[PDB]
Amino acid sequence: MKRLTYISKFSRPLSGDEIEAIGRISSQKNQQANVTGVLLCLDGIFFQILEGEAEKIDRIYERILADERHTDILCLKSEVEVQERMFPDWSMQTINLDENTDFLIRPIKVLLQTLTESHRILEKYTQPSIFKIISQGTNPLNIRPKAVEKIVFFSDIVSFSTFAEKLPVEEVVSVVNSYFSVCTAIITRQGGEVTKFIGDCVMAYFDGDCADQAIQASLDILMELEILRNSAPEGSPLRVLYSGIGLAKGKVIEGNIGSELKRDYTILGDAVNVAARLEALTRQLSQALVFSSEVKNSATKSWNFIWLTDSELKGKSESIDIYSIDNEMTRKSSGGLEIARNIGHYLERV
Amino acid sequence: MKRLTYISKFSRPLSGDEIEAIGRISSQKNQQANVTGVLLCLDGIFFQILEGEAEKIDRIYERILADERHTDILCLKSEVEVQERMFPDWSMQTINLDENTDFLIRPIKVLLQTLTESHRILEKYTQPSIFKIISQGTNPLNIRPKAVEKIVFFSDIVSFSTFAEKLPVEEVVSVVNSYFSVCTAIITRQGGEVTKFIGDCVMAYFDGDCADQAIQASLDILMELEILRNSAPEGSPLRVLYSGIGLAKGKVIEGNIGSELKRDYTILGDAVNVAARLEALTRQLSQALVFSSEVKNSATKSWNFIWLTDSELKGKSESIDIYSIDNEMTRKSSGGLEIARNIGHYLERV
Ligand SMILES: Cc1cc2nc3c(=O)[nH]c(=O)nc-3n(C[C@H](O)[C@H](O)[C@H](O)COP(=O)(O)O)c2cc1C
Ligand SMILES: Cc1cc2nc3c(=O)[nH]c(=O)nc-3n(C[C@H](O)[C@H](O)[C@H](O)COP(=O)(O)O)c2cc1C
Ligand SMILES: Nc1ncnc2c1ncn2[C@@H]1O[C@H](COP(=O)(O)OP(=O)(O)OP(=O)(O)O)[C@@H](O)[C@H]1O
Ligand SMILES: Nc1ncnc2c1ncn2[C@@H]1O[C@H](COP(=O)(O)OP(=O)(O)OP(=O)(O)O)[C@@H](O)[C@H]1O
Ligand SMILES: [Mg+2]
Ligand SMILES: [Mg+2]
Ligand SMILES: [Mg+2]
Ligand SMILES: [Mg+2]
C-alpha cells in the first residue's frame, strides 16, 4: 500500500458545517476506492492521512492539490511498501479539534498547535529539497559527503551598492527579493537548485550533465529581467535592475557543512570560485553571460556560441577559454561600465 | 503568570516506571510551589507545559535544564503576562502516549510523532536566533527591514583548495566543520551572530557598539586555532589549519532576504564587502587579523593597536587606514604566502 501524510492551511474562513461537508464527500469517495484515513483540523490548519492502493492514492491526491479551499500544502511523509492499514474502519474520519473538549485531548491540542505554528515558520527558512528527502523516509543529516560533478551558476546585481544608498530600506529589500524570486523560479524549473544567497548574489547548481539546462536558465533569466525593466511602473527602481551570470563545471563536494548550531546541505570546491570569477568579468563586457570551455564542451545542443578572446582570469590553474552566447540582447547592450554609470544617474533622480 | 513550553530528547532509554517516577516527584514539588502543568512523552521525546509565578518557574526550569536524563532541550514558547491557568487541577499530570490506546488519540499520536521528527531535523538547518524570536511570541517573517550600524566579521581558511585536492572527501568536510564550530562557539560567546557560511568562509556580525567584543572574539579564535594545531594527532590535517580575519563597521540593512522558497534573516551593505576585502589582505601579510580605522576608533579598551601603512584596498570610496593588533602570534608568524607553501608540502605527504 501507499500512505500519505500532509498538512495545509485554510485558504479562507471555513465553518464547522463546511468542514463536516468535506468529510462526508471524502468518505463517500474513499469508500468506493477502498481508501481509508483521517482528517483533522485545528485553528485553520488541516492534517490528513490517507492510505490505499498506490494509483488510487495519487489520483485522490491530485484532486486534493487542486482544491482551492486550502493552500500551502506540504507532504510530510510518503510511505510506499506499507504492510498494514492504520485506520481500517474509516473511509475518512473527520476530527474537528476546535470543537473537541475531551479530558486528555486538551493538552495534546495545545502541544499540536504550538509545534505546528513553529514548523510552518521554519519551512520558510529551509530549502524545499530538504523536506522532500525527509518525506521519503531519509534523515538528511545522516547523508555522507560525496565528490560529484556539477555545473555551478553564479549571478549578482550590477552596481547594487547604488540602490542601497539612494532608496528607502524597504525599497532596497523589495528589489533584491524580486531579483531572487525571478532567478529561483527559472532555475528550479530547469531542474537546478538554488543553494545560497550571498548579499545580492545567487549561488546555484545543476547536475554535471545539465549544461544545456544551465545555459537555458541563464538566457531565460536575462530575458525575464529585460521584460521587467521595460514594463516597470514610471520611476520604479526595477527599470535599472541588471544582472551578470557566470557558469563553470567541475568536481565538488556535496554534503552537510556547518557548525552544531546550523548547517546547510550545499557544495564546496574550486568550480565555485571559477563561476564567481567569471561572473565578475561580465562587469567589463557587453556580455551579461560568460561560461568556461568545460561548460561549452559539455553542452549537447547547437547553441550560438561565441569564443571570447579575452581570457584574463586570476587564480586559475592554467588559464581557461571563455565563451558566451551571441544573441540580440548582448549585441544591443551598451557595456558593463556604461551601465553602472546609467544606474547611478537614474537612481539619483527617482 | 508565566507559562513555559519546551521539548526534549531522552538522554538514554527510560522505562515507563522511570517516567512515572519523574511525574510523582514533579507533582510533589510543583504542588508546593503552586505550579501546574502537563508532561507528555512519545517515542523518546518529552513535551512539557508548566505555569505559575515567574520566579518559581525560572527556578524549576533551571533544575530541569540540569537533569541529565534528557537533552537537546528547546523552549518553544515563553508566555509572560498569562491571565488564566490552563491546567488548574494538575500539579503535574503525566501522560505516557506510548501506553495510550484510546480511540481518537491514535490518529493524533501519529500526527504528533511525524511533525516532531520533522521539526527536530529542521532545527539543525535553521539559526538559533530565529527560534528565540518565535518563542517570545513574535513571527520573524513579519519583521520589517531596518538600517542599523553593525560590526561585520569575515574569516576564511588559508589555501583550502589544497585540502580539497589532497585528502579524502570525509576528511575535507571534517576539517571545515571543525573550523566552523571553533568560530561559532567563540563568536556566540562574545555576543555576536554567525549569519552565513560561504564555502570555507564565515560571515558574522556584532552590534555597532561592540568593536571590543569583535576584536576579542578574533584574537580568541586565532589563539584557539594555534592550540589546535600544536595538539592535533600525528599526521592530522588540522596541524596546517590557518585562518585570516577582517573586520569593518558601517550602516547595513537587516531583514528577511530571499525568495518565496527560502529566506534568511541577515544583513546587506557595503561594510560586508569591506570586511571581505580586508580579510583577503591577510594573505599578503604576517598579520592574520586586520580591521578598518572605523572599528579601531569605535573600540573602548586600550588595545595594542598597530597602524599598518599599507592601505591599498580596491573598491573603496576614498581609501581607508588599516590596523591590527601586535601580539606574540603575529610577530612569530612566517607570512601569508610562505604559509600557503607550507600547507601544500605538508598535505602532499599525509
Ligand atoms: C482538507 C481537504 C481534504 C480532502 N480529502 C479528500 C479525500 O480524502 N478523498 C476525496 O475523494 N476528496 C477529498 N477532498 C476533496 C477533493 O479535493 C475534491 O473536492 C473531491 O474529491 C471532488 O469530488 P466530486 O468530483 O464528487 O465533487 C478534500 C478536500 C479538502 C479541502
Ligand atoms: C522531562 C522531565 C520533566 C521534569 N519536570 C519537573 C517539574 O515540573 N517540577 C520539578 O520540580 N522537577 C521536574 N523534573 C526533575 C528535576 O529535573 C529535578 O530532578 C527535581 O526538581 C529535583 O528534585 P529533588 O531535589 O527533590 O530530588 C523533570 C525532569 C525531567 C527529565
Ligand atoms: N567568490 C566565492 N564565492 C563563494 N564561495 C567561494 C568563492 N571563492 C571560493 N569559494 C568557496 O571557498 C572555497 C575555498 O576557496 P578560496 O577562495 O577560499 O580558496 P583557498 O584555496 O582557501 O585560498 P585563500 O588562501 O585565498 O583563502 C572554494 O572551494 C569555494 O567552495
Ligand atoms: N565578498 C563578499 N562576500 C559576501 N557578500 C558580499 C561580498 N561583496 C559584496 N557582498 C554583498 O553584496 C552586496 C553588493 O556588493 P557587490 O560587490 O555586488 O557590489 P555592487 O555595488 O553590486 O557592484 P558590482 O557591479 O561589482 O556587482 C554588498 O552590499 C554586500 O552585502
Ligand atoms: Mg553586485
Ligand atoms: Mg555582490
Ligand atoms: Mg580560503
Ligand atoms: Mg574562500
PDB file of N, CA, C and O in Angstrom, chain A residues 100-144:
ATOM      1  N   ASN A 100     -13.578  19.875  20.001  1.00  0.00           N
ATOM      2  CA  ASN A 100     -13.359  18.836  20.990  1.00  0.00           C
ATOM      3  C   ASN A 100     -13.066  19.433  22.364  1.00  0.00           C
ATOM      4  O   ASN A 100     -12.466  20.505  22.495  1.00  0.00           O
ATOM      5  N   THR A 101     -13.516  18.723  23.401  1.00  0.00           N
ATOM      6  CA  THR A 101     -13.289  19.166  24.769  1.00  0.00           C
ATOM      7  C   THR A 101     -13.036  17.991  25.706  1.00  0.00           C
ATOM      8  O   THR A 101     -13.317  18.082  26.907  1.00  0.00           O
ATOM      9  N   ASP A 102     -12.516  16.883  25.176  1.00  0.00           N
ATOM     10  CA  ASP A 102     -12.222  15.711  25.988  1.00  0.00           C
ATOM     11  C   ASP A 102     -11.026  15.977  26.896  1.00  0.00           C
ATOM     12  O   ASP A 102     -10.130  16.762  26.569  1.00  0.00           O
ATOM     13  N   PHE A 103     -11.019  15.289  28.039  1.00  0.00           N
ATOM     14  CA  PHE A 103     -10.010  15.468  29.077  1.00  0.00           C
ATOM     15  C   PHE A 103      -8.570  15.447  28.582  1.00  0.00           C
ATOM     16  O   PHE A 103      -7.860  16.451  28.692  1.00  0.00           O
ATOM     17  N   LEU A 104      -8.108  14.303  28.070  1.00  0.00           N
ATOM     18  CA  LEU A 104      -6.706  14.193  27.687  1.00  0.00           C
ATOM     19  C   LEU A 104      -6.390  14.857  26.366  1.00  0.00           C
ATOM     20  O   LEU A 104      -5.210  15.046  26.056  1.00  0.00           O
ATOM     21  N   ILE A 105      -7.402  15.165  25.562  1.00  0.00           N
ATOM     22  CA  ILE A 105      -7.164  15.842  24.294  1.00  0.00           C
ATOM     23  C   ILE A 105      -6.595  17.232  24.521  1.00  0.00           C
ATOM     24  O   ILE A 105      -5.699  17.679  23.790  1.00  0.00           O
ATOM     25  N   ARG A 106      -7.160  17.958  25.487  1.00  0.00           N
ATOM     26  CA  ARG A 106      -6.839  19.370  25.685  1.00  0.00           C
ATOM     27  C   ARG A 106      -5.344  19.626  25.716  1.00  0.00           C
ATOM     28  O   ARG A 106      -4.875  20.497  24.967  1.00  0.00           O
ATOM     29  N   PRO A 107      -4.539  18.916  26.509  1.00  0.00           N
ATOM     30  CA  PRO A 107      -3.097  19.212  26.467  1.00  0.00           C
ATOM     31  C   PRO A 107      -2.461  18.851  25.137  1.00  0.00           C
ATOM     32  O   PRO A 107      -1.540  19.540  24.681  1.00  0.00           O
ATOM     33  N   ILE A 108      -2.916  17.783  24.493  1.00  0.00           N
ATOM     34  CA  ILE A 108      -2.331  17.420  23.209  1.00  0.00           C
ATOM     35  C   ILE A 108      -2.639  18.488  22.170  1.00  0.00           C
ATOM     36  O   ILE A 108      -1.774  18.864  21.374  1.00  0.00           O
ATOM     37  N   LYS A 109      -3.873  18.987  22.152  1.00  0.00           N
ATOM     38  CA  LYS A 109      -4.215  20.064  21.231  1.00  0.00           C
ATOM     39  C   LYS A 109      -3.239  21.232  21.330  1.00  0.00           C
ATOM     40  O   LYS A 109      -2.799  21.782  20.313  1.00  0.00           O
ATOM     41  N   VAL A 110      -2.960  21.673  22.556  1.00  0.00           N
ATOM     42  CA  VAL A 110      -2.082  22.817  22.780  1.00  0.00           C
ATOM     43  C   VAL A 110      -0.684  22.527  22.258  1.00  0.00           C
ATOM     44  O   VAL A 110      -0.031  23.386  21.656  1.00  0.00           O
ATOM     45  N   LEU A 111      -0.195  21.315  22.506  1.00  0.00           N
ATOM     46  CA  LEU A 111       1.131  20.982  22.009  1.00  0.00           C
ATOM     47  C   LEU A 111       1.115  20.913  20.491  1.00  0.00           C
ATOM     48  O   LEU A 111       2.042  21.390  19.829  1.00  0.00           O
ATOM     49  N   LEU A 112       0.050  20.355  19.921  1.00  0.00           N
ATOM     50  CA  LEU A 112      -0.020  20.232  18.476  1.00  0.00           C
ATOM     51  C   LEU A 112      -0.057  21.605  17.822  1.00  0.00           C
ATOM     52  O   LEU A 112       0.653  21.853  16.842  1.00  0.00           O
ATOM     53  N   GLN A 113      -0.839  22.522  18.380  1.00  0.00           N
ATOM     54  CA  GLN A 113      -0.886  23.881  17.858  1.00  0.00           C
ATOM     55  C   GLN A 113       0.492  24.538  17.890  1.00  0.00           C
ATOM     56  O   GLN A 113       0.928  25.138  16.901  1.00  0.00           O
ATOM     57  N   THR A 114       1.175  24.473  19.042  1.00  0.00           N
ATOM     58  CA  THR A 114       2.426  25.210  19.186  1.00  0.00           C
ATOM     59  C   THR A 114       3.478  24.693  18.228  1.00  0.00           C
ATOM     60  O   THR A 114       4.229  25.475  17.634  1.00  0.00           O
ATOM     61  N   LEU A 115       3.557  23.373  18.074  1.00  0.00           N
ATOM     62  CA  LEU A 115       4.544  22.795  17.168  1.00  0.00           C
ATOM     63  C   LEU A 115       4.218  23.132  15.725  1.00  0.00           C
ATOM     64  O   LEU A 115       5.125  23.350  14.912  1.00  0.00           O
ATOM     65  N   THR A 116       2.927  23.152  15.379  1.00  0.00           N
ATOM     66  CA  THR A 116       2.542  23.441  14.005  1.00  0.00           C
ATOM     67  C   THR A 116       2.887  24.870  13.636  1.00  0.00           C
ATOM     68  O   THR A 116       3.404  25.127  12.547  1.00  0.00           O
ATOM     69  N   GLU A 117       2.581  25.825  14.514  1.00  0.00           N
ATOM     70  CA  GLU A 117       2.942  27.207  14.228  1.00  0.00           C
ATOM     71  C   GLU A 117       4.444  27.333  14.010  1.00  0.00           C
ATOM     72  O   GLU A 117       4.898  28.001  13.074  1.00  0.00           O
ATOM     73  N   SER A 118       5.229  26.670  14.850  1.00  0.00           N
ATOM     74  CA  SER A 118       6.674  26.754  14.738  1.00  0.00           C
ATOM     75  C   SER A 118       7.140  26.122  13.433  1.00  0.00           C
ATOM     76  O   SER A 118       7.914  26.727  12.675  1.00  0.00           O
ATOM     77  N   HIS A 119       6.605  24.943  13.115  1.00  0.00           N
ATOM     78  CA  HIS A 119       7.032  24.225  11.921  1.00  0.00           C
ATOM     79  C   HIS A 119       6.736  25.009  10.653  1.00  0.00           C
ATOM     80  O   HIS A 119       7.541  24.999   9.722  1.00  0.00           O
ATOM     81  N   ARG A 120       5.578  25.672  10.584  1.00  0.00           N
ATOM     82  CA  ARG A 120       5.225  26.399   9.373  1.00  0.00           C
ATOM     83  C   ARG A 120       6.079  27.648   9.182  1.00  0.00           C
ATOM     84  O   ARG A 120       6.208  28.135   8.051  1.00  0.00           O
ATOM     85  N   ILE A 121       6.643  28.190  10.262  1.00  0.00           N
ATOM     86  CA  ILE A 121       7.586  29.296  10.133  1.00  0.00           C
ATOM     87  C   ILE A 121       8.939  28.796   9.635  1.00  0.00           C
ATOM     88  O   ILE A 121       9.521  29.379   8.714  1.00  0.00           O
ATOM     89  N   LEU A 122       9.458  27.708  10.215  1.00  0.00           N
ATOM     90  CA  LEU A 122      10.771  27.201   9.817  1.00  0.00           C
ATOM     91  C   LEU A 122      10.813  26.765   8.360  1.00  0.00           C
ATOM     92  O   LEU A 122      11.880  26.818   7.729  1.00  0.00           O
ATOM     93  N   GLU A 123       9.693  26.271   7.833  1.00  0.00           N
ATOM     94  CA  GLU A 123       9.640  25.884   6.428  1.00  0.00           C
ATOM     95  C   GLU A 123      10.180  26.998   5.543  1.00  0.00           C
ATOM     96  O   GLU A 123      10.914  26.747   4.578  1.00  0.00           O
ATOM     97  N   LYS A 124       9.846  28.242   5.871  1.00  0.00           N
ATOM     98  CA  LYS A 124      10.227  29.351   5.005  1.00  0.00           C
ATOM     99  C   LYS A 124      11.707  29.700   5.090  1.00  0.00           C
ATOM    100  O   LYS A 124      12.205  30.389   4.191  1.00  0.00           O
ATOM    101  N   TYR A 125      12.405  29.271   6.154  1.00  0.00           N
ATOM    102  CA  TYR A 125      13.844  29.464   6.311  1.00  0.00           C
ATOM    103  C   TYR A 125      14.662  28.239   5.868  1.00  0.00           C
ATOM    104  O   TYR A 125      15.888  28.275   5.994  1.00  0.00           O
ATOM    105  N   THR A 126      14.029  27.170   5.340  1.00  0.00           N
ATOM    106  CA  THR A 126      14.752  25.954   4.967  1.00  0.00           C
ATOM    107  C   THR A 126      14.466  25.575   3.516  1.00  0.00           C
ATOM    108  O   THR A 126      13.420  25.895   2.952  1.00  0.00           O
ATOM    109  N   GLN A 127      15.417  24.858   2.913  1.00  0.00           N
ATOM    110  CA  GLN A 127      15.337  24.566   1.483  1.00  0.00           C
ATOM    111  C   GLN A 127      14.256  23.525   1.190  1.00  0.00           C
ATOM    112  O   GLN A 127      14.175  22.516   1.895  1.00  0.00           O
ATOM    113  N   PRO A 128      13.460  23.700   0.119  1.00  0.00           N
ATOM    114  CA  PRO A 128      12.451  22.663  -0.217  1.00  0.00           C
ATOM    115  C   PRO A 128      13.052  21.281  -0.430  1.00  0.00           C
ATOM    116  O   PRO A 128      12.420  20.271  -0.085  1.00  0.00           O
ATOM    117  N   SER A 129      14.271  21.219  -0.974  1.00  0.00           N
ATOM    118  CA  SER A 129      14.910  19.939  -1.253  1.00  0.00           C
ATOM    119  C   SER A 129      15.110  19.131   0.018  1.00  0.00           C
ATOM    120  O   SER A 129      15.059  17.895  -0.013  1.00  0.00           O
ATOM    121  N   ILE A 130      15.318  19.808   1.149  1.00  0.00           N
ATOM    122  CA  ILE A 130      15.452  19.108   2.419  1.00  0.00           C
ATOM    123  C   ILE A 130      14.158  18.384   2.785  1.00  0.00           C
ATOM    124  O   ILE A 130      14.188  17.214   3.182  1.00  0.00           O
ATOM    125  N   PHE A 131      13.005  19.053   2.642  1.00  0.00           N
ATOM    126  CA  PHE A 131      11.723  18.445   3.005  1.00  0.00           C
ATOM    127  C   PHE A 131      11.405  17.205   2.177  1.00  0.00           C
ATOM    128  O   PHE A 131      10.822  16.239   2.692  1.00  0.00           O
ATOM    129  N   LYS A 132      11.673  17.261   0.872  1.00  0.00           N
ATOM    130  CA  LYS A 132      11.453  16.105   0.010  1.00  0.00           C
ATOM    131  C   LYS A 132      12.185  14.884   0.554  1.00  0.00           C
ATOM    132  O   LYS A 132      11.611  13.793   0.661  1.00  0.00           O
ATOM    133  N   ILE A 133      13.457  15.061   0.928  1.00  0.00           N
ATOM    134  CA  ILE A 133      14.241  13.947   1.454  1.00  0.00           C
ATOM    135  C   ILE A 133      13.594  13.394   2.718  1.00  0.00           C
ATOM    136  O   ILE A 133      13.402  12.177   2.856  1.00  0.00           O
ATOM    137  N   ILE A 134      13.244  14.283   3.655  1.00  0.00           N
ATOM    138  CA  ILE A 134      12.582  13.866   4.893  1.00  0.00           C
ATOM    139  C   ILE A 134      11.321  13.065   4.582  1.00  0.00           C
ATOM    140  O   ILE A 134      11.079  12.007   5.173  1.00  0.00           O
ATOM    141  N   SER A 135      10.493  13.560   3.651  1.00  0.00           N
ATOM    142  CA  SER A 135       9.227  12.892   3.346  1.00  0.00           C
ATOM    143  C   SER A 135       9.425  11.540   2.668  1.00  0.00           C
ATOM    144  O   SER A 135       8.473  10.757   2.598  1.00  0.00           O
ATOM    145  N   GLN A 136      10.620  11.245   2.169  1.00  0.00           N
ATOM    146  CA  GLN A 136      10.891   9.957   1.544  1.00  0.00           C
ATOM    147  C   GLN A 136      11.430   8.942   2.535  1.00  0.00           C
ATOM    148  O   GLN A 136      11.763   7.822   2.137  1.00  0.00           O
ATOM    149  N   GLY A 137      11.528   9.311   3.808  1.00  0.00           N
ATOM    150  CA  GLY A 137      11.949   8.402   4.847  1.00  0.00           C
ATOM    151  C   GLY A 137      13.404   8.513   5.249  1.00  0.00           C
ATOM    152  O   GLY A 137      13.822   7.802   6.169  1.00  0.00           O
ATOM    153  N   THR A 138      14.175   9.387   4.600  1.00  0.00           N
ATOM    154  CA  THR A 138      15.590   9.583   4.875  1.00  0.00           C
ATOM    155  C   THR A 138      15.811  10.810   5.749  1.00  0.00           C
ATOM    156  O   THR A 138      15.198  11.860   5.533  1.00  0.00           O
ATOM    157  N   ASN A 139      16.718  10.682   6.718  1.00  0.00           N
ATOM    158  CA  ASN A 139      17.148  11.824   7.516  1.00  0.00           C
ATOM    159  C   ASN A 139      18.332  12.498   6.834  1.00  0.00           C
ATOM    160  O   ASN A 139      19.435  11.934   6.835  1.00  0.00           O
ATOM    161  N   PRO A 140      18.180  13.709   6.274  1.00  0.00           N
ATOM    162  CA  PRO A 140      19.292  14.308   5.500  1.00  0.00           C
ATOM    163  C   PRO A 140      20.517  14.623   6.343  1.00  0.00           C
ATOM    164  O   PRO A 140      21.626  14.758   5.803  1.00  0.00           O
ATOM    165  N   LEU A 141      20.360  14.723   7.653  1.00  0.00           N
ATOM    166  CA  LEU A 141      21.528  14.993   8.464  1.00  0.00           C
ATOM    167  C   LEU A 141      22.536  13.851   8.449  1.00  0.00           C
ATOM    168  O   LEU A 141      23.689  14.074   8.832  1.00  0.00           O
ATOM    169  N   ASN A 142      22.134  12.643   8.033  1.00  0.00           N
ATOM    170  CA  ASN A 142      22.997  11.460   8.034  1.00  0.00           C
ATOM    171  C   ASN A 142      23.538  11.083   6.656  1.00  0.00           C
ATOM    172  O   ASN A 142      24.165  10.025   6.527  1.00  0.00           O
ATOM    173  N   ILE A 143      23.276  11.890   5.627  1.00  0.00           N
ATOM    174  CA  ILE A 143      23.874  11.674   4.314  1.00  0.00           C
ATOM    175  C   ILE A 143      25.375  11.936   4.395  1.00  0.00           C
ATOM    176  O   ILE A 143      25.825  12.939   4.973  1.00  0.00           O
ATOM    177  N   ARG A 144      26.162  11.008   3.845  1.00  0.00           N
ATOM    178  CA  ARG A 144      27.604  11.182   3.807  1.00  0.00           C
ATOM    179  C   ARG A 144      28.015  12.161   2.705  1.00  0.00           C
ATOM    180  O   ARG A 144      27.375  12.226   1.646  1.00  0.00           O
TER     181      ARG A 144
END
